[PDB]
DNA sequence: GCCG
DNA sequence: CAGTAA
DNA sequence: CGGCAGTACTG
């Protein structure tokens with residue numbers, strides 16, 4: 001359906017350069033425009049037409065028309081030579097633009113440089129060991145197998161636990177970057193202490209191979225981010241994210257964890273225009289903010305038993321997970 | 327970068 | 331806290 | 337001019 005491939009391919013290069021150099025708001029603008037172009041019904045053929053599309057302004061319009069007339073984009077030719085190396089480094093899990101830029105300034109140019117000379121955090125060393133694996137997407141059928149491994153282990157010590165795979169899986173994608181498993185209990189209390197029992201059970205059977213984020217000390221753990229691998233030959237290491245939530249938060253946690261990320265941001269932005277606030281925990285009304293958009297007063301939580309309730313309270317038509325890519 |  | 335991530 | 341989402345770990 002992308003009727004503007006020659007344009008977007010060039011804009012994506014520029015967008016990625018801004019992102020990895022840390023100019024996140026400018027990169028957000030490019031991401032907004034690129035999506036608007038991927039979804040326009042026709043080839044965009046004029047400056048006046050390009051401007052009419054939400055997310056495209058005068059500046060983006062004159063880049064589009066430069067591409068159309070000449071097949072090239074002058075700005076690409078002056079992208080810093082550092083950008084491919086910065087992208088290489090920031091694809092290490094646990095390293096972002098700041099770390100990538102420091103490693104670059106220190107003279108490193110390759111993952112061999114990083115391995116042999118760089119200071120690495122515990123997470124980054126795991127990211128580097130699984131560098132290729134964390135860039136691959138698994139078939140969704142393997143995500144099912146991972147969800148079932150987690151569900152069988154959780155339900156072995158409490159059969160009442162509800163487990164649901166979210167993210168790209170629940171949105172129906174053919175491949176998945178990780179598996180996002182949401183766990184809750186329909187009664188309202190038994191979700192306490194389950195992380196400790198769950199993670200121990202998945203470690204005893206050899207399924208978890210490394211931990212990236214897991215605060216197991218004080219019992220208030222909300223998320224586990226780590227690495228798993230199914231048994232047998234031909235298996236890769238896969239990213240696993242688990243969250244455990246109170247039942248009263250199930251609809252908002254499901255909404256958050258199904259995403260997409262841009263869908264969540266657009267929904268939360270709409271809530272803010274209404275004096276409301278939407279998080280993974282709750283939809284709140286009568287939220288008080290200052291002129292900068294920052295919360296200065298808490299509001300009150302609205303009951304949201306189902307995802308449909310959240311849309312309804314925001315004045316929105318319900319959208320099925322497969323329709324939430326943007 | 328866009329846009330209110 | 332800054333950095334990174336979901 | 338200035339916001340662009342709202343959260344949870346790490347050290």
Ligand SMILES: O=c1ccn([C@H]2C[C@H](O)[C@@H](COP(=O)(O)NP(=O)(O)OP(=O)(O)O)O2)c(=O)[nH]1
Nearest residue numbers: 167168176177178256257258259260261264336
């Ligand atoms: O910045 C973010 C990132 C993720 N999220 C939510 C939405 C996202 O779908 C969910 C899971 O995050 P993932 O990184 O797993 N993204 P997703 O599952 O959609 O795609 P994939 O895992 O296949 O890359 O967390 C946000 O709200 N903000």
Ligand code: NA
Nearest residue numbers: 090092093095
């Ligand atoms: Na990274």
Ligand code: NA
Nearest residue numbers: 167168178180
């Ligand atoms: Na995911």
